[PDB]
Amino acid sequence: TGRPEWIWLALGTALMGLGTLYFLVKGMGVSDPDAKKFYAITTLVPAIAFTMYLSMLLGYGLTMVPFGGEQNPIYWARYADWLFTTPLALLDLALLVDADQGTILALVGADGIMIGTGLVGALTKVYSYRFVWWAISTAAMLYILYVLFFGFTSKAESMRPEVASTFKVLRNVTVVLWSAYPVVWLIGSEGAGIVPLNIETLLFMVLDVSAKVGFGLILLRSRAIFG
Amino acid sequence: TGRPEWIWLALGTALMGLGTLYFLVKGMGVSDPDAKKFYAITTLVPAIAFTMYLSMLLGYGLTMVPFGGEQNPIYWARYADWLFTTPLALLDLALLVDADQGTILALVGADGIMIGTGLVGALTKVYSYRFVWWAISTAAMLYILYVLFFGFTSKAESMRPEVASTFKVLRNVTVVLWSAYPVVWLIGSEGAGIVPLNIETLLFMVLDVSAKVGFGLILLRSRAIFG
Amino acid sequence: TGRPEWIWLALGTALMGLGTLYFLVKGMGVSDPDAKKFYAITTLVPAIAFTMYLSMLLGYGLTMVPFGGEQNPIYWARYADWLFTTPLALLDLALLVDADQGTILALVGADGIMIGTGLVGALTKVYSYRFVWWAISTAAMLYILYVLFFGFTSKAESMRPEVASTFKVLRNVTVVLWSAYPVVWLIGSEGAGIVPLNIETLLFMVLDVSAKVGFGLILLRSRAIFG
Ligand SMILES: CC(C)CCC[C@@H](C)CCC[C@@H](C)CCC[C@@H](C)CCOC[C@@H](CO[C@H]1O[C@H](CO)[C@@H](O)[C@H](O)[C@H]1O[C@H]1O[C@H](CO[C@@H]2O[C@H](CO)[C@H](O)[C@H](OS(=O)(=O)O)[C@H]2O)[C@@H](O)[C@H](O)[C@@H]1O)OCC[C@H](C)CCC[C@H](C)CCC[C@H](C)CCCC(C)C
Ligand SMILES: CC(C)CCC[C@@H](C)CCC[C@@H](C)CCC[C@@H](C)CCOC[C@@H](CO[C@H]1O[C@H](CO)[C@@H](O)[C@H](O)[C@H]1O[C@H]1O[C@H](CO[C@@H]2O[C@H](CO)[C@H](O)[C@H](OS(=O)(=O)O)[C@H]2O)[C@@H](O)[C@H](O)[C@@H]1O)OCC[C@H](C)CCC[C@H](C)CCC[C@H](C)CCCC(C)C
Ligand SMILES: CC(C)CCC[C@@H](C)CCC[C@@H](C)CCC[C@@H](C)CCOC[C@@H](CO[C@H]1O[C@H](CO)[C@@H](O)[C@H](O)[C@H]1O[C@H]1O[C@H](CO[C@@H]2O[C@H](CO)[C@H](O)[C@H](OS(=O)(=O)O)[C@H]2O)[C@@H](O)[C@H](O)[C@@H]1O)OCC[C@H](C)CCC[C@H](C)CCC[C@H](C)CCCC(C)C
Ligand SMILES: *C\C=C(C)/C=C/C=C(C)/C=C/C1=C(C)CCCC1(C)C
Ligand SMILES: *C\C=C(C)/C=C/C=C(C)/C=C/C1=C(C)CCCC1(C)C
Ligand SMILES: *C\C=C(C)/C=C/C=C(C)/C=C/C1=C(C)CCCC1(C)C
Ligand SMILES: CCCCCCCCS[C@@H]1O[C@H](CO)[C@@H](O)[C@H](O)[C@H]1O
Ligand SMILES: CCCCCCCCS[C@@H]1O[C@H](CO)[C@@H](O)[C@H](O)[C@H]1O
Ligand SMILES: CCCCCCCCS[C@@H]1O[C@H](CO)[C@@H](O)[C@H](O)[C@H]1O
Numbered sequence: 001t002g003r004p005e006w007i008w009l010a011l012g013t014a015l016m017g018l019g020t021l022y023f024l025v026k027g028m029g030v031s032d033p034d035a036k037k038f039y040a041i042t043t044l045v046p047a048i049a050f051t052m053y054l055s056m057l058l059g060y061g062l063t064m065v066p067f068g069g070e071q072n073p074i075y076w077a078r079y080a081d082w083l084f085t086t087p088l089a090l091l092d093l094a095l096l097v098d099a100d101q102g103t104i105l106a107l108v109g110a111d112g113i114m115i116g117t118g119l120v121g122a123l124t125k126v127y128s129y130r131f132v133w134w135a136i137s138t139a140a141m142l143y144i145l146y147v148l149f150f151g152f153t154s155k156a157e158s159m160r161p162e163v164a165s166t167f168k169v170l171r172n173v174t175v176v177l178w179s180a181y182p183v184v185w186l187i188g189s190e191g192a193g194i195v196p197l198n199i200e201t202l203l204f205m206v207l208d209v210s211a212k213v214g215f216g217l218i219l220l221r222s223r224a225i226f227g
Numbered sequence: 228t229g230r231p232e233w234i235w236l237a238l239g240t241a242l243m244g245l246g247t248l249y250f251l252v253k254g255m256g257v258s259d260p261d262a263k264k265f266y267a268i269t270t271l272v273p274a275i276a277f278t279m280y281l282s283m284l285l286g287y288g289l290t291m292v293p294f295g296g297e298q299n300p301i302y303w304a305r306y307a308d309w310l311f312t313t314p315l316a317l318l319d320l321a322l323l324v325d326a327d328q329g330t331i332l333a334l335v336g337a338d339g340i341m342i343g344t345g346l347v348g349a350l351t352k353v354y355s356y357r358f359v360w361w362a363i364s365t366a367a368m369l370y371i372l373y374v375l376f377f378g379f380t381s382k383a384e385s386m387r388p389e390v391a392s393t394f395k396v397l398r399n400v401t402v403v404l405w406s407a408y409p410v411v412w413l414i415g416s417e418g419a420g421i422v423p424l425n426i427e428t429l430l431f432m433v434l435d436v437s438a439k440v441g442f443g444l445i446l447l448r449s450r451a452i453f454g
Numbered sequence: 455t456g457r458p459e460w461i462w463l464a465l466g467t468a469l470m471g472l473g474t475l476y477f478l479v480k481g482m483g484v485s486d487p488d489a490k491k492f493y494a495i496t497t498l499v500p501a502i503a504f505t506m507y508l509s510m511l512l513g514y515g516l517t518m519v520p521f522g523g524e525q526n527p528i529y530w531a532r533y534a535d536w537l538f539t540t541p542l543a544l545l546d547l548a549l550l551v552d553a554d555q556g557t558i559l560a561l562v563g564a565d566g567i568m569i570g571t572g573l574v575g576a577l578t579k580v581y582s583y584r585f586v587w588w589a590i591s592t593a594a595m596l597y598i599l600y601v602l603f604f605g606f607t608s609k610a611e612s613m614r615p616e617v618a619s620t621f622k623v624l625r626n627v628t629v630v631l632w633s634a635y636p637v638v639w640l641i642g643s644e645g646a647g648i649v650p651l652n653i654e655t656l657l658f659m660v661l662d663v664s665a666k667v668g669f670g671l672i673l674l675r676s677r678a679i680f681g
Contacts, residue, residue: 036329044336051344051363058356060347084339102490109498112538117505120514129512136505263556271563278571278590285583287574311566 005201009057012205016050019213023220038225041092042216045085049212052081067127072189073197078204079119086111089174089215093148096167096224097155107144114140122190134191138182145175166224170215177211232428236284239432243277246440250447265452268319269443272312276439279308294354299416300424305431306346313338316442320375323394323451324382334371341367349417361418365409372402393451397442404438459655463511466659470504473667477674492679495546496670499539503666506535521581526643527651532658533573540565543669547602550621550678551609561598568594576644588645592636599629620678624669631665
């Protein structure tokens with residue numbers, strides 16, 4: 001406890017945790033080699049989100065950064081979580097659409113830069129600089145979203161209707177959800193202090209649980225994952 | 228020198244080093260594309276263990292963590308070593324058994340969580356919390372071992388007898404050896420101080436050399452690695 | 455500004471940045487699945503070099519290390535950059551030559567050790583030790599270069615002449631360029647202070663831009679990347 005946002009963290013820890021248990025149980029005895037990958041990728045996302053949120057609740061994933069003439073509390077664990085989970089979500093989309101290795105590598109590369117560059121931004125002591133990294137990170141994201149919206153859709157159009165429509169849903173959700181992140185970051189205590197850490201944490205929480213549990217639900221409950 | 232455990236560290240450095248030289252020399256001119264992978268994975272394990280142990284001997288891989296109302300010496304390099312070496316050992320087992328990519332990804336994912344979560348546990352300042360991470364890490368391990376014992380055996384049963392029996396041996400050794408780690412950690416200066424750092428280091432040393440040099444010996448000296 | 459080497463850093467940031475824009479634009483609408491990988495790998499190298507150089511210019515990728523009875527400025531970001539970019543360059547060479555997965559894994563493994571071990575060397579407080587890690591790192595490099603010069607050439611000899619000769623060029627450039635790194639490091643402020651940080655930074659700059667932009671140019675402007 002202590003920190004006023006501890007509650008959104010513990011709630012997030014709980015949801016990632018149960019979300020994992022459920023996906024695990026649901027994938028129990030699934031032999032389809034293709035479904036397995038989908039289950040392994042999707043189940044690993046919340047499992048990681050769980051460990052990271054718990055680190056924020058317990059205090060480990062929290063550090064202090066001086067900028068703006070003050071010591072600001074920065075949750076680095078969010079980045080460590082995203083670093084490993086965004087690529088997996090990208091893999092799910094790639095497997096569903098049967099993307100070229102070349103484009104998978106670019107997206108993954110684009111993603112690592114986005115999170116890494118975003119983490120650098122969060123830990124920068126010169127207020128003004130935080131926004132530069134936020135722009136480099138956001139540009140990287142637009143590149144990923146641009147390719148997922150156009151390139152992948154075109155790819156999904158060659159799969160059977162169940163796959164095509166499930167991808168469309170997953171596609172619309174990732175574009176909307178992902179674009180919300182740089183916004184919250186910009187208005188939260190890491191960029192402009194237009195919003196308090198308390199709210200900043202609640203937003204990322206809902207944004208995080210939707211992207212990892214919801215996304216998993218949408219995909220795993222469709223037949224789209226079966227060869 | 229200095230630290231009373233320097234000797235187990237230097238001895239470990241020596242053994243990882245010679246273990247690498249030997250595996251390297253032994254793999255010299257091997258054309259079998261399958262044997263090569265086995266040699267590349269197995270030879271890389273001690274090569275990494277070498278660099279990490281040397282970092283502990285020289286002092287770099289040693290840090291201090293306050294918990295229990297004291298500054299405890301923590302060898303983080305052990306974790307950095309394990310982070311990269313456990314996945315490789317898992318790859319060896321997977322290649323021997325011809326595991327599904329989906330299960331390879333889950334194990335690797337399970338493994339990163341195990342070591343990462345274990346490293347977080349080692350660096351936590353709130354004594355009580357160290358044990359929580361130890362449980363999350365140990366649960367992750369049981370998942371890996373459960374899948375390697377049942378899932379893989381079943382897989383090996385479809386390979387020729389040389390492969391089947393070599394896997395059985397490797398399987399029995401990893402289960403026994405791996406389960407020893409969380410125990411040493413629990414009774415060592417990182418959990419309950421039932422045992423001194425001096426002994427704690429000697430145990431991990433023997434546990435480490437057996438798992439990386441011994442395991443490599445067992446596998447590399449069998450015909451099991453040949454297509 | 456401030457640091458006397460800021461200029462070589464900003465110039466490097468600019469060149470990596472433009473080098474990326476150009477490779478991106480050049481790869482615009484390329485359908486050849488093989489060419490795409492080549493473009494994705496090659497374009498990602500400078501994109502990462504860009505983010506890292508910018509971190510050095512802005513000051514983030516700069517830290518201070520005490521050794522020799524003084525606080526020496528150490529640019530860790532160089533290592534973080536190399537950690538991700540050398541493996542990619544290795545992948546390009548591997549794809550051009552169609553290397554065995556086993557050898558790809560060994561080189562990548564050899565490379566991570568080289569950079570990691572080199573980073574450890576840069577951050578070591580005991581002057582004398584810095585040179586030990588420099589030797590372990592350099593040995594790792596010789597292993598990579600030895601395999602790229604002999605093993606790969608032999609491999610390229612089985613491809614069509616355009617591929618064979620482009621590889622020869624790329625091969626000669628990586629051997630010469632890569633061997634220059636441990637030298638600059640040895641004579642620069644990180645090893646023997648025979649050369650000032652100012653020059654040390656200018657050399658790595660030219661060495662870096664040549665290896666990432668030049669290399670990319672040579673490869674991407676040849677037909678060698680087409681199946
Ligand atoms: C697997 C996955 C896909 C990839 C994951 C990336 C991961 C593996 C690696 C990163 C690389 C690593 C090997 C390099 C680490 C070296 C290590 C020694 C340095 C670590 O520090 C870097 C951290 C920053 O730490 C900072 O935050 C903490 C917590 O808040 C602080 O405690 C710490 O001090 C901070 O350090 C920064 O500030 C220091 C400031 O010190 C002093 O501070 C005072 C005021 O307090 C004054 O300002 C002083 O100034 S003065 O008075 O002296 O003048 C000032 O000195 C600095 O000294 C430090 O240097 C530092 O700025 O951040 C890590 C950031 C990220 C992870 C790195 C960049 C990653 C890049 C974007 C990745 C692209 C990867 C992509 C995935 C490619 C995939 C390719 C495939 C193969 C295809
Ligand atoms: C490639 C491989 C498979 C993956 C490898 C993972 C690797 C790449 C990445 C980790 C991610 C990275 C990008 C984020 C780094 C950000 C960086 C700025 C922070 C680094 O710190 C994190 C370290 C902890 O450092 C701590 O230990 C050192 C050494 O002992 C200390 O010097 C340092 O200070 C410590 O920092 C902790 O404590 C700080 C405390 O500061 C103050 O301390 C005082 C007392 O001393 C008081 O307690 C103060 O309190 S108060 O008074 O102010 O109130 C207190 O503030 C904190 O401030 C710090 O925040 C911190 O708690 O640990 C890193 C841990 C691990 C590596 C991260 C979690 C990883 C997760 C389990 C990985 C799953 C990966 C799996 C492999 C997925 C694979 C997916 C595939 C694609 C399929
Ligand atoms: C994805 C890619 C391919 C792989 C990338 C590797 C990356 C993911 C992971 C590294 C692993 C990580 C999980 C472990 C991190 C734990 C963390 C808590 C520790 C981090 O510290 C390690 C840093 C060093 O930080 C140091 O530099 C900064 C900046 O300058 C300092 O601020 C910091 O303090 C430094 O810490 C060192 O010094 C400390 C000293 O403290 C005190 O200092 C005073 C003087 O100032 C006195 O000397 C004190 O002495 S005394 O008085 O008390 O007696 C002294 O205590 C120490 O306490 C610290 O312990 C430390 O020495 O470095 C990270 C180095 C590298 C990245 C790790 C080794 C990596 C290895 C070679 C990798 C092989 C990988 C290969 C790629 C395999 C691929 C396999 C495939 C699956 C096939
Ligand atoms: C954990 C699940 C998901 C879907 C995480 C997504 C995170 C992002 C898209 C983060 C993007 C960032 C940008 C674009 C710039 C500001 C820094 C961020 C890392 C928050
Ligand atoms: C380097 C070679 C091997 C086989 C290393 C294995 C390490 C483990 C199985 C470590 C497990 C841990 C657990 C289960 C919980 C406590 C923290 C540890 C990381 C020690
Ligand atoms: C970013 C582009 C390239 C080609 C980087 C190459 C870097 C090296 C070959 C670095 C080698 C090192 C050695 C051999 C020993 C000293 C420490 C270094 C990391 C500089
Ligand atoms: C704390 C560790 C959490 C690890 C989570 C791993 C995600 C595992 S998904 C699981 O993977 C199996 C392969 O092993 C498939 O056969 C199953 O169908 C699938 O559901
Ligand atoms: C310090 C750097 C240590 C690097 C260790 C790399 C392990 C290399 S194993 C070696 O890989 C070759 C492919 O290159 C195979 O052809 C050989 O049969 C096999 O034995
Ligand atoms: C800041 C983020 C920078 C990201 C850089 C990614 C490198 C992308 S190369 C690009 O990849 C496409 C697949 O997506 C191929 O179809 C194109 O032919 C090729 O040119």
